[PDB]
Amino acid sequence: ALHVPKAPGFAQMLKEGAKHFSGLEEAVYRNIQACKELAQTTRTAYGPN
Amino acid sequence: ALHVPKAPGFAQMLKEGAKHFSGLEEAVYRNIQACKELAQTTRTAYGPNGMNKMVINHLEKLFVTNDAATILRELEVQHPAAKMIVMASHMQEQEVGDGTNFVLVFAGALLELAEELLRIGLSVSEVIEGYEIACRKAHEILPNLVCCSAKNLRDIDEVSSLLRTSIMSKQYGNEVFLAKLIAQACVSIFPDSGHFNVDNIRVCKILGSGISSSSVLHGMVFKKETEGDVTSVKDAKIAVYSCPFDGMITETKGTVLIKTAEELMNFSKGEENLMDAQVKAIADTGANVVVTGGKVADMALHYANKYNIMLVRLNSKWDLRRLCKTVGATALPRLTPPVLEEMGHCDSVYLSEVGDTQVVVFKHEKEDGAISTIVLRGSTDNLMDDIERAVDDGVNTFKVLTRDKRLVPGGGATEIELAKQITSYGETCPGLEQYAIKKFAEAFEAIPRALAENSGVKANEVISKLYAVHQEGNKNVGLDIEAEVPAVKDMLEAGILDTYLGKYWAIKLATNAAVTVLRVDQIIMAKPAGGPKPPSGK
Amino acid sequence: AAVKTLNPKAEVARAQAALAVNISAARGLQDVLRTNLGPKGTMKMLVSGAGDIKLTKDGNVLLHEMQIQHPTASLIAKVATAQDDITGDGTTSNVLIIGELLKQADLYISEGLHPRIITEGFEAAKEKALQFLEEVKVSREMDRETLIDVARTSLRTKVHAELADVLTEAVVDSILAIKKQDEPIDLFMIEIMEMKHKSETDTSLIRGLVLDHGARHPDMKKRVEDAYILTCNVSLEYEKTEVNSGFFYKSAEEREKLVKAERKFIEDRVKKIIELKRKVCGDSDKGFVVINQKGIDPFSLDALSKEGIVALRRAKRRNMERLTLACGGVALNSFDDLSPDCLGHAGLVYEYTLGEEKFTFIEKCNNPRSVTLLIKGPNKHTLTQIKDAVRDGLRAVKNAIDDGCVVPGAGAVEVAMAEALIKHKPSVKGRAQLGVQAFADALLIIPKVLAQNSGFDLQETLVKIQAEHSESGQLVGVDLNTGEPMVAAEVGVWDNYCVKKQLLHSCTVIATNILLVDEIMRAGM
Amino acid sequence: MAAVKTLNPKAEVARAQAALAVNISAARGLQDVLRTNLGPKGTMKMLVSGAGDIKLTKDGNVLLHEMQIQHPTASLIAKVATAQDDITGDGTTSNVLIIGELLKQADLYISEGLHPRIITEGFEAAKEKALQFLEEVKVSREMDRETLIDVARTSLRTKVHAELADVLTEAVVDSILAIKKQDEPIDLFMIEIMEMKHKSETDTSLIRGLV
Amino acid sequence: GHRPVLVLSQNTKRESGRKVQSGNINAAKTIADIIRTCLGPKSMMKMLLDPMGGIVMTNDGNAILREIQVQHPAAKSMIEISRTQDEEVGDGTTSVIILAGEMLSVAEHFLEQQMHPTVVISAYRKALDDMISTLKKISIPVDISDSDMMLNIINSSITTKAISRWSSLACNIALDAVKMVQFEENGRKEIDIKKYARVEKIPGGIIEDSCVLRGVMINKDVTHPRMRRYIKNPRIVLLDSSLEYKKGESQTDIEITREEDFTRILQMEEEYIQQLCEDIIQLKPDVVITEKGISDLAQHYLMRANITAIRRVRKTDNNRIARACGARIVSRPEELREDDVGTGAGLLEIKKIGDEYFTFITDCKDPKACTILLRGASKEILSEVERNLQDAMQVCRNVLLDPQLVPGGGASEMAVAHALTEKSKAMTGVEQWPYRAVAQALEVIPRTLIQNCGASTIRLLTSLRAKHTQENCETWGVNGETGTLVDMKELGIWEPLAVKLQTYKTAVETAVLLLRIDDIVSGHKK
Amino acid sequence: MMPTPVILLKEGTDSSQGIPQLVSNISACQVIAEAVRTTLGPRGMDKLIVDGRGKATISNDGATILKLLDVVHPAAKTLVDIAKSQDAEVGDGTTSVTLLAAEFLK
Ligand SMILES: Nc1ncnc2c1ncn2[C@@H]1O[C@H](COP(=O)(O)OP(=O)(O)O)[C@@H](O)[C@H]1O
Ligand SMILES: Nc1ncnc2c1ncn2[C@@H]1O[C@H](COP(=O)(O)OP(=O)(O)O)[C@@H](O)[C@H]1O
Ligand SMILES: Nc1ncnc2c1ncn2[C@@H]1O[C@H](COP(=O)(O)OP(=O)(O)O)[C@@H](O)[C@H]1O
Ligand SMILES: [Mg+2]
Ligand SMILES: [Mg+2]
Ligand SMILES: [Mg+2]
Ligand SMILES: [Mg+2]
Ligand SMILES: [Mg+2]
DSSP: OOOOOOOTTHHHHBOSSOOOOOSIIIIIHHHHHHHHHHHHHHHTTOSOO | OOOOOOOTTHHHHBOSSOEEEESIIIIIHHHHHHHHHHHHHHHTTOSTTOOOEEEEOTTOOEEEEOOHHHHHHTSOBOOHHHHHHHHHHHHHHHHTSSOHHHHHHHHHHHHHHHHHHHHHTOOHHHHHHHHHHHHHHHHHHGGGGOOEEOOOSSOSHHHHHHHHHHTTSSSOSSOHHHHHHHHHHHHHSSOSSSOOOGGGEEEEEOOSSOGGGOEEESEEEESOOOSSSOOEESSOOOEEESSOBSOOOOSSOEEEOOOSHHHHHHHHHHHHHHHHHHHHHHHHTTOOEEEESSOBOHHHHHHHHHTTOEEEEOOOHHHHHHHHHHHOOOOBSSSOOOOTTTOOOOSEEEEEEETTEEEEEEEOOSSOOSOEEEEEOOSOHHHHHHHHHHHHHHHHHHHHHHHOOEEEETTTHHHHHHHHHHHHHHHTOOSTHHHHHHHHHHHTTHHHHHHHHHHTSOHHHHHHHHHHHHHHTOSSEEEOSSOSSOOEEEHHHHTOEEEHHHHHHHHHHHHHHHHHHHHEEEEEEOOOOOOSOOGGGO | OHHHHHOTTOEEEETHHHHHHHHHHHHHHHHHHGGGSSTTOOEEEEEOTTOOEEEEOOHHHHHHHSOBOOHHHHHHHHHHHHHHHHTSOOHHHHHHHHHHHHHHHHHHHTTTOOHHHHHHHHHHHHHHHHHHHHHHOEEOOOOHHHHHHHHHHHHHHHSOHHHHHHHHHHHHHHHHHHOOTTSOOOGGGEEEEEEOSSOGGGOEEESSEEESOOOSOTTSOSEESEEEEEEEOOOOSOOOOTTOOOEEESSHHHHHHHHHHTTHHHHHHHHHHHHHHHHHOSSSSEEEEEEESSOOOHHHHHHHHTTTOEEEOSOOHHHHHHHHHHTOOOOBSOOSSOOGGGOEEESEEEEEEETTEEEEEEEOOSSOSSEEEEEEOSSHHHHHHHHHHHHHHHHHHHHHHHSSEEEETTTHHHHHHHHHHHHHGGGSOTTHHHHHHHHHHHHTHHHHHHHHHTTSOHHHHHHHHHHHHHHHOOOEEEOTTTOOEEEHHHHTOEEEHHHHHHHHHHHHHHHHHHHTEEEEEEOOO | OOHHHHHOTTOOOOOTHHHHHHHHHHHHHHHHHHGGGSSTTOOOEEEEOTTOOEEEEOOHHHHHHHSOBOOHHHHHHHHHHHHHHHHTSOOHHHHHHHHHHHHHHHHHHHTTTOOHHHHHHHHHHHHHHHHHHHHHHOOOOOOOHHHHHHHHHHHHHHHSOHHHHHHHHHHHHHHHHHHOOTTSOOOGGGSOOOOOOSSOTTOOOOOSSOO | OOOOOOSSOTTOEEOOTHHHHHHHHHHHHHHHHHHGGGOSTTOOEEEEEOTTSOEEEEOOHHHHHHTSOOOSHHHHHHHHHHHHHHHHTSSOHHHHHHHHHHHHHHHHHHHTTTOOHHHHHHHHHHHHHHHHHHHHHHOBOOOTTOHHHHHHHHHHHHTTSGGGGGHHHHHHHHHHHHHHHOEEETTEEEOOHHHHEEEEEEEBSOGGGOEEESSOEESOOOSSTTSOSEESSOOEEEEOSOSSOOOOSSOOOOOBOSSTHHHHHHHHHHHHHHHHHHHHHTTOOSEEEESSOOOHHHHHHHHHTTOEEEOOOOHHHHHHHHHHHOOOOBSSGGGOOTTTSBOOOOOEEEEEETTEEEEEOOOOSSOSOEEEEEEESSHHHHHHHHHHHHHHHHHHHHHHHOOOEEETTTHHHHHHHHHHHHHHTTOOSTTHHHHHHHHHHTTHHHHHHHHHHTSOHHHHHHHHHHHHHSSSOTTEEEOTTTOOEEEHHHHOOEEEHHHHHHHHHHHHHHHHHHHSOOOOEEOOOO | OOOOSSOSBOTTOOOOOSHHHHHHHHHHHHHHHHTTGGGOSTTOOOEEEEOTTOOEEEEOOHHHHHHHSOOOOTTTHHHHHHHHHHHHHTSSOHHHHHHHHHHHHO
16 A cells, blocks of 8 residues: 556556656647747847847 | 566565465465375384484474474474464374374375375365265274273273383383383372373483383472481471561561661561571471472571471472472461471482482372372483373373273274275265265375384285285284284284274364365465564463 | 656556556455355465464455555455444455446446446446345344354355354354343353364353463362352452552561561451351352452462462453353452342352363353353364354344344345346436446346356356346345255345445445546655 | 476466466557557657657557567567558558457456357357458449549548648559559559658659659 | 865755746646646545555545645645645635646746736736625625525535535534534634534444434443443533542652551552542532543442443543533542533433444533544545535534625636726736736636536637626536536535635735745755 | 475475485494594593683593583484483493494494
8 A cells, every 4th residue: 555556558568768658748748848948948049139 | 578477466466575376286286295295204203113303493402202293393394284284283192192193194195185086076175075974984983993991090000001002102112111110100190089180290300320220209309409407307297388488578668777776786686586486486396398489598597407407499389389289288378387287298308319410309108199200210311301202192191091991903903994994985975975985094094004114014915914804804903013024913912002082083183184274275375574483472 | 747747756647547556456356355255165374474374264354364565455455344343244245346346337437438427327326226125125033043044144154064053053042142132232241262172163152251261279179069259350469558658667576567467458358258258158068259350469369268269360351241241240349348249140160271271161150141152173273263253153143133134145135136226227317327237237246256156157147047036036046056046035045234235335435436536646755 | 386487486477367367458558559549530659769769650560669568468469460561551550459359358258257269269250250241341343543542541641641641642643553554463662762851741742753 | 185165065056047936836837737637526536645554535635735745845835825725714725726826827927028026926916906806796695594505505515525425414414513513602702613523433334324413422431341331311520630549749758667557558548539439429420531540449439329430531522521511620529519510411322333332422402512423434435524524614614704605616716807807907007917817817717627527628618708708697607517607696506705715815825925936045954 | 306386394404314314323423432432441542622712621531522522413412412421320431331332333
């Protein structure tokens, strides 16, 4: 009653180092966050100033 | 594609160290194999020709013996099924006192034949029911196999002849001498009242002279020394005290409050005079031996020496109680002089030396008394331990004979007769239970087979001869160990006899253990723990 | 996930993963406990870390002894523990029904159905099922025969057939001995004392008490024919002053006087006891037994033994009530005013010695309102198994007496309930009919498991029983010897009404709550 | 713990219902992953290799190859799908889904004590009946341009975006019709697939020659 | 050697700038997303694993938040505001978190657009004041004398919990307990349900058998079996001092020189016990409940007068019994008076439940304390039922203190949002944009209700907003089951005004607090 | 011999059976006798044994020499025990007992 086991099926068959992101919140929003961060890093060099 | 994952469900939920065995092959066959291994280990010690085993326990205390119960106790058994068989054997030992090796042999044979029956197709329930029916039939048959009864237990020759068979399995070379000793010891005990107490026989082991010098004493022996000057008393009038041989003190707290010089100068003199008066009052009753359970004060010892009183100190309360029983004295809780009924009497009390051991002997002269002591000589501690085990077996045999006087032939005659009758009964039973009944009958063959194997002859010819003779109509014919060729002879003439209760209880317990082991289908073993034993075992 | 984003060392299962984890755990528990159900079940061997052997068939004991570290298993274990604490039976059926409900619900959830509709169907089916159970119960006057039938139905499932037959008489007689008219039954008045020296079939019922301690003085009588019982809670040993008294003396004679005087408090109570004993019996015909909850020092023991009184010290706390109800005396906390009417009466007291352990028997009471059960067996695990079996039997008999109605067993009631639920399904609005069907198919697990454990197969046995029930309407169960349908009421296979109601309620509630869980979380570190 | 365990202590064995549950769980997991692939309304998956290469795909065979699985049943199903893709070139996702559903429906009856042999016999009978029905239901037709366009639509719409699928339909149909010889097997080696990386993804087309 | 020289100690990290604000707002959004799905009548329960090995299967937002551990300080602030909301009003714990997360999320937009956080905070406070005004405007009064309306309010409170199946029984239990606990003395009204409304959980039985007793129930039993376990109209005497013989605190030592002094001391101990028992008996009670031990001799002396005694009872239980049966706890029995004797209990029964003895002092007339006896499937189910009953009792107390009600199911959210937008339409400063942003961010509650109901968010929410653009539509929300817009004057879902006020205040103030923060510093020691 | 996943006794249990263990026991008794042979007769020689503490026990009595030997062989300990027995009962002959026992066995 102290450890949550891995769900049966694909969750258990996944390799040791592999990651599986699925669903709106887990995939689309995180990708959008990463792209927004990249644009933020490059933003300050835009324009003559 | 290189690993087989654990099956979903219970297999994944099992703890890290646990083990789960389910089904015939994984549980029942393994349990039967373990029980068979245990029985095989103990088998070679069965019978008069059985040989001792040197067993070293976890404390490096050496045990050498051919008593099956002792070997099992000193063996660190781990398999739960073998543990169950060991528990059955120990219950057999506690209930009767002999037949533990019979319990192991019968249980192992039953489980092996049950395994082969399960292999040929019979279900567990059918085998269990067949064994139960066959055990009931054997219990019904057994009383008809009784050959003779003890019919007297106050005699010496008859009791020795009865206990000779019991203590011939252990110490095969010299059983007549041990039989005589144990017979005398038990006949002194066992008064007109039918009740016989096993604990009323005390065994004292003094090293040096070889076991042929052992004797029986109508009294009691302590491996201690007298604490006074007097070392011998001729007409002892023992007075037993459970209190320390010293002046009593308050249980709350005692402080000597001195306010004047006179009290300070007189306190010690008054205390000494009080002790002297108490000791003289004790001595004036005629008591010339004083036995105390506590410490002895110096002033009390001096005043006892002044009045020629032997002092004996017994630390163990059990020793004090047994001395009171064997002398007839009452353990006084205070140091008051004993009244005439409370004063015990012993025909002779004296300090003596046996070998290098100093002993105090409370010796009677009558062939009676509540407690009798057997002094065991020898050349080794292990040898005396084995002799003590044989003495315990003989005493338990005498107790059983007091409980029930019926006897059955030994030497495998009873087992072969039982096998023949149970096989005959099984052939008349239609249905699948006949195989189980026949296998239960065949399991009785393991006793004469083990006896023949230990005696050094070929077992099969012995068993075939036993069947031939029993079919001829002789129910009292068993193995003859006094021959180099497979041969049989009548047990009744030889006097090789076994107690009826011993066989009855052994059969019942072996069958119960085998059936209970067979009833188990799944095993769930927790991860072993290194904890320092459960608190119940202390 | 969000939890792992906040707490990196967090274990989380979400939605479908949560359902999969819960249902897999329930299925594993069901697969383990399938073999337990019914008298034809298989016993298990349970070896602890210390090597202790535990042979058992009870569902609750098994659940407590399996080496499981799963959350859903913990929830189901708590439910079964509550079941056992209140009713004392049906834990295995509880686990089986929970697992079957979860499996049947998953059978529909995997096809896109939302669990909420399944739970609504479960609620409707539970209400209809409870109504049907109310309708189908058999109200009866609980005579000895019906109680024997119920006790048999429990014990035969728990232990060996012959041992069960003995325990039936033992348990039924024990309950009937202490039962009072229209008064709740106190099971604390049935002492369960176990010895370890004879066969399992030697278990019997003693119309009195058996105490696990004996007299501490060798000179006390080992057997008293006719005895007066004095149940007291008074210390008879030396007691120290609460205010740090201490003694002061100036000579040995003064010390002797103070030593003799300090015993007067205990000596007064011993003298009162002795005077009462002399008054009640002026000859040696009658006996006197003193059972004290507190210690008795050797001086008091010797003083009592010189008067021919048997004294037992450090008795159990419940033994005070048990002796007052059985022997019929009055438990005394002080000897301020003790009269002969406060003495109990026992028609036989004797001591039994078992190796190092001693026992005292108190039999031949007049109308013993408290009795004892003597568990005898060659092994410790046999004693434990028999103790659990008699606990189950006592609970079953008490429930049967408390509820004047009893329910036919052998799986008949579940078959009838399933048919009634199927008939009622069209009346349910919406897609909750799927939940109703799942509930009915889950209720049908009991006859299925009985057929499995009896060696038959589920399909044709179940369809034969269902067809027989539809043709006649009788409550037909499972005949574990032939597999044919059989009327449980006629043969005498009864189940407790309270047990069935508790199973329905608890199983439905826990299944509904588990199905609505969409996230197992562990972020407390 | 079993027969094999005694001889080889470091052996991993799953026997009887354990093995059945293991196989069915693996098949169900594969089916759960590939459920979202089926149909033109399916969802694209992003697969990242160890080196960091990004591969957006919807093909069942490609996803099976690029999934991070080490299960024996998964390997068997992957081999079956690979053979399907090698021969016919379509239906891998349907293969996985049908296998998983077959195993699930079989276990639905097996858990009720039914032996798997009966289920397999029923499978054989159903398979032969289904083959007969499929033979009876197929539509014999003249493979004109319109029918080939419809088939190419039905495949490419499930594979890619609708506009790209519309372009690729004309491209592939014209390419096949160009190299097709009457009453001769079609040699797919004669359609070179050369990729250039400078224009928009709708600029792919067919060249009546070689590049 | 030459160890490095530095200003601040090692492991003293520091962050600053937009990174800290983005991190704080993201942490708040994550906390909101943790429990977003646990809002509404169609919520899904969550299963939490205690570090001690326990399991908490709950739907309450506060329990879920307090059962998890976080490292980011903004998440800690969110947990703190959840606990504050739970303590202050009793419910709304999983709504304030969502509201605060949404407010911070919409403030991030303005933070990234060169707007100083002070302007945002000022706009937030203006919005909060106008929210308070609008809620006080759209509220409706309630007559607490009508039991049906109170039951309806409690039901609307508990439809989102797991006890909605037995809602009727739960509402009756909560209302009865709150009414009985209600008390007044010296002109000071008091409704203290945390001390005198005790919830006792006995696993087993059926939850339909749960009830509120007109008395108290403790897990105790008679000291002596011969004592009566069933008294019709008991007179109760409560004590919180031992009935034994005890040493004095002064160091007292005796010095015994005479023979009889020891026995005399023991006899005086017995006589002291007898004198105490006689002092108790002089009042002629029927049951004596003590907080400390009772000596066996005292038990005998009490039994001679046919008096049942219970030995050791906790302080809280003794106070609760005193409130229920009208007794008064007295330490020294010599000062015991007639007024201290507790009459008013209608029955004392010591029955057996399962394998335990429980003491009932039920059937009281005018009892000011109660014990809610809960029975159910298991321990976790009973814990969740107890939490739901706590929510119901808190809502009932809030309604009793403040008889104001406001529409539920998002109707209040949309009404306040529309009023805020209409008021902002006349604003001219730069502050109008964050003001309107908070106004529309208040619409997260109906959106979350629709999302949990499984309906389509965009069209339903647009239609709801269009409905609220009309004049007399302030009571239009959504169905948590069917996903349709209904008038809450017809559906009947209402929540106390105090709950909504506390929720809005806490959400806006948490947004302000986390907006004021910059330049996180960590690593130092106490 | 097969692994037998669950074993009968605890691991590390040593069992020796048959004629070879008896011959080994006889050899051990021979070693014990040889350890004291040269102390017999008017031409006997003493033995010096040093304990762990460093104390030296120079002796000619056979029983003392056997006691100072830290014998752990179960069969060899019998010779030490009988030497102690002979010393206790009589006081002389503690070498002859061991020599005779080992000679019988040989
Ligand atoms: N002189 C003898 N000849 C043949 N058999 C004997 C003789 N003495 C004893 N036995 C047999 O030996 C068996 C006793 O074996 P034993 O080693 O005592 O095992 P246990 O201690 O378990 O009883 C008895 O069954 C008896 O029949
Ligand atoms: N002799 C019998 N014949 C047919 N059915 C039986 C018989 N005995 C018991 N049963 C049925 O089998 C079930 C036994 O369940 P049991 O093993 O007692 O589980 P639990 O201990 O959890 O109640 C009962 O529900 C009863 O209806
Ligand atoms: N039947 C219903 N239909 C629509 N909305 C409802 C219904 N019942 C309750 N609600 C809404 O759900 C919210 C209560 O959800 P709950 O889980 O209790 O959250 P909290 O714990 O924050 O109060 C209230 O704001 C109320 O407006
Ligand atoms: Mg023997
Ligand atoms: Mg049962
Ligand atoms: Mg395709
Ligand atoms: Mg709420
Ligand atoms: Mg010499």
